[PDB]
Symmetry: C2
């Protein structure tokens, strides 16, 4: 739709590519900040940090993903051409309870996110194509609600899917590394159905690079030809725009992953780059002060995102294809 | 909208007065069935019971409120000219928690309610207008959410507001009666706002009648003229169509109420008529047999709903006036 079209435009760069900078972390940002004090850090500090990354980096990113809990200040503080995505999900899951069931931050509607200047709504779903139906019917129902909400509100709905298995507790394990292709791919095929009214898929690379021939410094799980195929399968697995999420892999492995994707023939439409662009500034902020972090950002930070945008320009494909 | 209008007319009769049978009760019914033997009521017992009541009485009602968990079979069963609304809220709330927070039926969405052929979608909300904003911001956001879904799914949004005040535990008290008009009327003013996309309001009569002059075998809270102003204020409080909920008052007093309503000037558009009119048939069903309960429904049952319809034809203004 036109307004949906207009809105996704504000989140992409000149070549038609989404280059959002992810900074919607909450409980996780506190943890990282903990380490340098290590004592509980203030809401004030946490907002302030985001504001800095906002202020200093938004000029080089085509958009930013921030959270309504602490990111509203930083989102006022953002740049002009930059654009904006707002996280709608409650963070984490229940360690006690089964299913990592989805749940919107209780003081928010799609309507409230739109009135706050957001160009898209994002929502993180933990899904597992093999979990019980009683689990997945809920997760499904939920997404239909957001799917529907957003349509009435004329605002892009970006679905983030993270994959998991109760059987396979540990994520980067060899055992899970075998099933990731199915788990990721299959989720996309499902949530590509029109009844979810999804606009862009936010997803992980369909393999775990750390076990790809020519990348692994331990056990290999797929040969390059194999893994190239899994990317192709992923490209084909949806007909909607998709972007890759870094998911705490490094600035440089992720850079290398894009070129790899591209060369397998994956026509992906951009990225969403998080911990791996700004993370060095957390330390420099706590240990060494405000203008100290402002420095890192204008050098180590800008380099990281430049390097990224340059790789992206050679690798990604415009979302309008 | 074109569809919402055409759908509401599936719920009214052809003279424009909504006369919906309330039969969405869950836990509440289940107990009833165990008030005839202190043992278990089965999932398919409840189903066929609901079926039975729907088959008989939906001849003489222009719509039926039912529920997804126990009323899917009865919804197929209904008479052809009976409209269908499906409940969307989890029944009750958490008694250990504070603010009677609302919550959808986990396997549902306004999309999956339309897909079962519901001409309308219903949400009972407990609202106290003077409750803390930390509570009420959640309520408003939740309603904003459901409203959008229904806009997008192009289906009517019927919101029911039952009022309360935690400072006044007894709803039937003299202290409550005094505050009732504002609690009721103000919540109508809030939820008539465009952001909540409400199509029809299911609301209580703005006064406790047990204390209106010349109705009050006890103590008076308002003169006939004060009460009339409260009905007048109610009708004025909203520009949407609204229908009154019997709220467990007797058939006699309720009927008497609709006359007072019409006389004060309230242009109310019908009633949601509740358990009172089908109750008696439960004990006959169980203890007396299936063909017996069917008789009750054809004679006693018929009578209660027919009577109401008559008072209704002499009292309610059309939702389209």
């Amino acid at each position: 739709s036109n307004q949906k079209i207009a809105s996704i435009e504000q989140l992409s760069n000149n070549e038609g590519i989404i280059s959002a900078l992810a900074f919607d972390q909450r409980g996780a940002l506190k943890r990282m900040m903990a380490k340098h004090q290590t004592e509980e850090p203030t809401v004030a500090q946490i907002e302030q940090l985001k504001v800095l990354v906002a202020e200093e980096l938004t000029q080089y990113a085509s958009s930013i993903l921030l959270d309504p809990e602490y990111g509203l200040p930083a989102s006022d503080a953002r740049n002009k051409d930059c654009g904006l995505l707002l996280a709608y999900e409650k963070t984490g899951y229940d360690v006690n309870a089964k299913g990592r069931l989805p749940d919107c931050l209780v003081e928010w509607s799609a309507k409230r996110l739109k009135e706050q200047g957001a160009n898209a709504v994002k929502f993180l779903l933990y899904y597992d194509v093999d979990d019980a139906e009683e689990i997945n019917i809920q997760k499904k129902a939920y997404i239909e609600r957001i799917g529907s909400e957003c349509v009435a509100e004329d605002i892009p709905f970006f679905l983030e899917v993270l994959t998991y298995d109760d059987n396979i507790p540990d994520n980067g394990s060899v055992e899970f590394a075998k099933v990731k292709p199915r788990k990721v791919n299959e989720a996309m095929k499902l949530f590509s159905e029109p009844r979810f009214n999804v606009d862009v898929l936010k997803v992980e690379v369909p393999v775990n690079m750390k076990y790809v021939e020519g990348f692994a410094e331990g056990e290999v799980v797929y040969t390059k030809e194999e893994a190239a195929q899994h990317f192709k399968d992923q490209d084909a697995a949806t007909h909607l725009p998709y972007i890759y999420l870094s998911a705490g892999v490094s600035a440089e492995l992720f850079q290398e992953t894009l070129k790899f994707a591209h060369e397998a023939g994956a026509k992906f439409n951009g990225v969403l780059c998080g911990r791996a662009t700004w993370s060095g500034a957390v330390q420099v902020y706590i240990e060494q002060g405000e203008d100290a972090a402002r420095e890192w950002l204008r050098t180590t930070g800008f380099k990281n995102i430049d390097d990224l945008n340059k790789v992206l320009k050679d690798t990604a494909t415009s979302w309008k294809q």
